[PDB]
């Protein structure tokens, strides 16, 4: 569901994508635990205030370059389950029919 | 009297005596003319100077103070007569001339 | 033992690129493997001949230089 | 033992044409290989010429003919000029 | 709406051509080539020792010959109004070169 | 001696190509053939004359042609050896 290195799903508009958790945020201690480990916010690592006080997660999206890693809070990231794959197919088909209606 | 090099007498830098000895020991002919090693050393020195000049020009164009095999390859392939002379000669680590066919260019 | 498969397709692609090749068919790689093998036999046979005539057991670079020279492919930078 | 080469003479020629340009070891190795190649080519052609005319001596004329046969155009002309000048200077000296 | 960036077919190829027509280092892995050379050097003689310089000279000559053959193949394919080389181009190139 | 390269008539080049296994021939080939042949002849004759002059002779022998062809990597048999 939500563990360091575990598979996680993340929303993005009308779509969602599978990502890998690398840092799990603890707002109370103002530190994130990372795997190559309680460490505070880094010299370049920074989380926006609206999600730094919630359970945030620094993730890398599978199939996408490492330049697009995102600090996603608990709002979008869900527990990796088969039903999440069902919703993935659901909005994938939604985008498919949206594009088809755009064309045809 | 004091020994004077035959290269100095001919005003050359290439060792005429070594050239003459190698000609004698090279099994090319029974006898060797006296003016032969001078001529050969002069021709070798001229060709060396030509290609060294071209290689130094190439090295300077690369803002480098030392000539590398890449400079030698570029100088040889860029000079038409020199390239024809070394037509079947392969230079180690010389690379190739940067050349791309027109039709492969994006249009 | 299939060291001919040690010549992977990335290396063939790199050589083609240095050769100025843009698009490569999939059947090319094995053809290059065969041609390179033929070239290697042609050179190595003469190299071993030179090594044996010198009554030696270790092949020297000068042997390869002579073999290349007698095949019309002069090489510099090695002696 | 000791092996002879053309390193010093090529170095002097380089310092004459480019009195400030250095050189690497691989470059002068290629230089020596090229020098030996040219030497063997010219000497073999000269020996072939001498045997062609049934003569036991290799003179500067044979080298001139060999250079004319082996070098293309302007290189041949310039090398002929250099050889002639060097021969005349050495004989006069 | 998120799309991943990717160049069109034929761009990375030209970039690689420019990159490798500039550099001069060897392109083939050393150990596989050495193993292939040693394996080939068995149907003429057994227990053959090798100076490293011989192996590297072999690699240099082989790579140069392969590059020249590649360039000839490229010319042959272009003459056929194509941008892709197929082995018949190599065969024609080696045939005209006299290797065949 | 001017305008002799036109002496190689189109039927001659046609016969040469037919021996070469050529079935259909473009019309703008013959001048290219003449130019290439001229280049080859010049290259051979230069060395042949060089050999003749080195011997201080005034006539060019076939044997000189043999040496010139040999030096250019084109060996010819049956002309003196």
Swiss-Prot record, chain A:
GO BP term, example: regulation of DNA-templated DNA replication initiation
Domain of life of the source: Eukaryota
Localization: Nucleus
Keyword Transcription regulation in annotation: yes
Main subcellular localisation: nucleus
GO CC annotation terms, alphabetical: histone acetyltransferase complex; NuA4 histone acetyltransferase complex; nucleosome disassembly/reassembly complex; nucleus; Rpd3S complex
One Gene Ontology molecular-function label: methylated histone binding
Bias kind Basic and acidic residues: ranges: 37-43, 97-104
Domain Tudor-knot: 7-78
Keyword Transmembrane helix: no
Keywords, ordered alphabetically: Chromatin regulator, DNA damage, DNA repair, Nucleus, Phosphoprotein, Transcription, Transcription regulation
General function of this protein: Component of the NuA4 histone acetyltransferase complex which is involved in transcriptional activation of selected genes principally by acetylation of nucleosomal histone H4 and H2A. The NuA4 complex is also involved in DNA repair.
Subunit structure: Component of the NuA4 histone acetyltransferase complex composed of at least ACT1, ARP4, YAF9, VID21, SWC4, EAF3, EAF5, EAF6, EAF7, EPL1, ESA1, TRA1 and YNG2.
Family: Belongs to the MRG family.
Further remark: Present with 1890 molecules/cell in log phase SD medium.
Protein name as annotated: Chromatin modification-related protein EAF3
Organism: Saccharomyces cerevisiae (strain ATCC 204508 / S288c)
Gene that this sequence comes from: EAF3
From Swiss-Prot, chain C:
Residues carrying Phosphoserine: 25
Cross-link (Glycyl lysine isopeptide (Lys-Gly) (interchain with G-Cter in UFM1)): 9
Covalent link (Glycyl lysine isopeptide (Lys-Gly) (interchain with G-Cter in ubiquitin)) residue numbers: 69
Source taxon at top rank: Eukaryota
Assigned keywords, A-Z: Acetylation, Chromosome, Citrullination, DNA-binding, Hydroxylation, Isopeptide bond, Methylation, Nucleosome core, Nucleus, Phosphoprotein, Ubl conjugation
Post-translational modification N6-succinyllysine, affected residues: 9, 55, 69
PTM-bearing positions, type N6-glutaryllysine: 9, 37, 55, 57, 69
Positions bearing N6-butyryllysine: 9, 22, 55, 57, 69
Positions of post-translational N6-(2-hydroxyisobutyryl)lysine modification: 9, 22, 37, 55, 57, 69
Gene Ontology MF terms: DNA binding; protein heterodimerization activity; structural constituent of chromatin
Compartments where found: Nucleus; Chromosome
GO cellular component entries: nucleosome; nucleus
Residues bearing the modification N6-lactoyllysine: 9, 55, 69
Residues where Phosphotyrosine is found: 29, 66
Residues bearing the modification N6-propionyllysine: 9, 22, 55, 57, 69
GO biological process: nucleosome assembly
Post-translational modification: Demethylation is performed by JMJD6.
Modified residues (N6-acetyllysine): 9, 37, 57, 69
Protein family according to the UniProt entry: Belongs to the histone H4 family.
Function of the molecule: Core component of nucleosome. Nucleosomes wrap and compact DNA into chromatin, limiting DNA accessibility to the cellular machineries which require DNA as a template. Histones thereby play a central role in transcription regulation, DNA repair, DNA replication and chromosomal stability. DNA accessibility is regulated via a complex set of post-translational modifications of histones, also called histone code, and nucleosome remodeling.
Subunit structure: The nucleosome is a histone octamer containing two molecules each of H2A, H2B, H3 and H4 assembled in one H3-H4 heterotetramer and two H2A-H2B heterodimers. The octamer wraps approximately 147 bp of DNA.
UniProt name for this protein: Histone H4
Native source organism of the sequence: Xenopus laevis
Coverage span on the entire protein: 24 to 102 of 103
UniProtKB/Swiss-Prot annotation, chain D:
Cell compartments where the protein resides: Nucleus; Chromosome
Transmembrane parts of this sequence: none
Disulphide-bridged cysteine pairs: none
Glycosylated residues in this chain: 81
A single MF term (Gene Ontology): DNA binding
Family label: Belongs to the histone H2B family.
Protein name, UniProt field: Histone H2B 1.1
Residues of the full protein shown: 33 to 125 of 126
